[PDB]
């Protein structure tokens, strides 16, 4: 887990 990962919707299911 990275709180700074830039994907905004990609990682949401």
């Amino acid at each position, epitope marked *: *887990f*990275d709180s*700074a*990962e*830039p*994907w*905004t*919707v*990609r*990682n*949401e*299911d």
Partner: antibody
Amino acid sequence: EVKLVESGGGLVKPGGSLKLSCAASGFIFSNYAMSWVRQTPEKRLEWVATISGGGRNIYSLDSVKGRFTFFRDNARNTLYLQMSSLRSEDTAMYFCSRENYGSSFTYWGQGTLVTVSS
Amino acid sequence: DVLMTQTPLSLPVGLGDQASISCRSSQSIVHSNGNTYLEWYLQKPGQSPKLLIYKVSNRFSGVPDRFSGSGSGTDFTLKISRVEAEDLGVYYCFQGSHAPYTFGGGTKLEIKR
């Protein structure tokens, strides 16, 4: 509907600077992360960076850190790539691309060509 | 970093025949959230790349069901059933699980006239 259009590409000398733009329409811009991906003259694809919807979180290639910066203007529906200290290895077609649920590069622009050469 | 090895480099197929393209990651590409962001792209002559397949086996909307993706571990495969002339171009695999994200070297699909 969804449209992405890059611009700013051109010939620059080694060590030079260039700013790329990417205009977006057809969606709520700030709801989506955007990426830069480049295609080399050898036709290889290379991810360069991804920036969050809000513009404050960025992943990028280590080899462009300290050279390239990435930012967006959400009030103007525009994504930017500020290049400096350009190298021959940077010569490529630069694409901007919008994410979607489940996928990294869902919509692509047409590209803008950057040539680094004396 | 994760190296993506794509084979074959080119693939001549008759119309109506099947094409199968392989992608091997140098290590595991399971994302921290448990998904595998393995994607396939097609670049037709003169055009930008376009998304075909995401999270290993999911077809992007508007993509014909002739295209399917499968795989696990470090081995992934794009299959085209009953190839059509519109399928011409270079296919690329891509992993978006571990930064820096990396593309396979591509496979050029050609028609055996």
